[PDB]
Amino acid sequence: KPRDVQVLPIATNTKVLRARSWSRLRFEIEYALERGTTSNSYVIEGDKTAIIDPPVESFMKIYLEALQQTVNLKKLDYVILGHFSPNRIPTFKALLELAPQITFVCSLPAAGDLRAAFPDDNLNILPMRGKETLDLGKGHVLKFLPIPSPRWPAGLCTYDVQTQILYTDKIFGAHICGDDVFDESFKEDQRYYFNCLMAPHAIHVEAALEKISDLQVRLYAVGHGPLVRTSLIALTQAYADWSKAQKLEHHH
Ligand SMILES: [Cl-]
């Protein structure tokens, strides 16, 4: 099948765009189960509009086409980044051209990287250190929880108090492409994902879990795979169990 974008309302004023691929994006171990992947981006429309996590260059064209069909790019206020990677730069560059008014919202360690990627541009950047919130209006107050780790110094979770959705980007996902938007049995895929991408940073995973533990969450709006709804509590417990196990191995 060809790559496409799946768009669906998920909450009040909230939609997901899942850019889908039935084959690996890279020749790397995280795709080695050969089940494809999705890259998930989100749109919250309050008084102000924010997008969360625009995908890599590979999905850029179909992403922007779908986004243009969903929102008026001249009405776009914020682009929130769950982390920073150079393979997203071309997507940011296209967004900037189409919506020159946008403000980038990121964890502090990403701010420098952004400005360097657009050196002869004057970027609007709003770094979030964890104290300040961002009000989109209509109740959509965003809380920011930086989860810096050696792998993702600018790792950031975002929580919408109105919908109780936590945007977790790399945390809690799975590399699997299917028709189902929401999470059942891709437990194997979530576990493999943890082992590929989370396990080497187990003490930081634990720190992240502690940070989010006081939140009332109805959905993990993850960066890859099905959105974690009903399996949220069980997956969170699994991440905790898998993390303490890894710590045993790490020591030897
Ligand atoms: Cl990062």
Q: How far is the CA of 214 from the centre of ligand 1 (A)?
A: 24
C-alpha torsion 59→172→219→95, nearest 10: -30
Q: How was this structure determined?
A: X-ray
Q: How far is the CA of 117 from the centre of ligand 1 (A)?
A: 14
Reference 203, options 152, 170, 250; nearest CA is 250
For the stretch 160-183, what's the b/e string if a residue is b when 16 or more beta carbons lie within 10 angstroms of its beta carbon?
bebbebbbbbbbbbbbbbbeebeb
Query: Domain containing 159: what range?
Result: 1-252
Q: How far is the CA of 105 from the centre of ligand 1 (A)?
A: 13
Q: How far is the CA of 181 from the centre of ligand 1 (A)?
A: 26
Residue 71: what residue type? Answer: V
Residue 16 CA to residue 43 CA, distance in Å, equals: 7
Number of domains in the chain: 1
Hey, which residues does 155 pair with through a beta bridge?
Answer: none
Residue 244 CA to residue 206 CA, distance in Å, equals: 8
Alpha helices for the chain (secondary structure H)? 57-70, 89-98, 108-117, 187-193, 202-212, 232-251
Q: How far is the CA of 83 from the centre of ligand 1 (A)?
A: 4
Phi, psi for residue 36 in degrees, rounded to 5: 75, -160
Q: Return the SS3 of 115.
A: helix
Q: 99: domain CATH number?
A: 3.60.15.10
Reference 176, options 166, 167, 185, 168; nearest CA is 185
Q: How far is the CA of 108 from the centre of ligand 1 (A)?
A: 10
Reference 105, options 68, 71, 135; nearest CA is 135
Q: How far is the CA of 113 from the centre of ligand 1 (A)?
A: 9
The two three-digit tokens of residue 122, written as one number: 């004057």
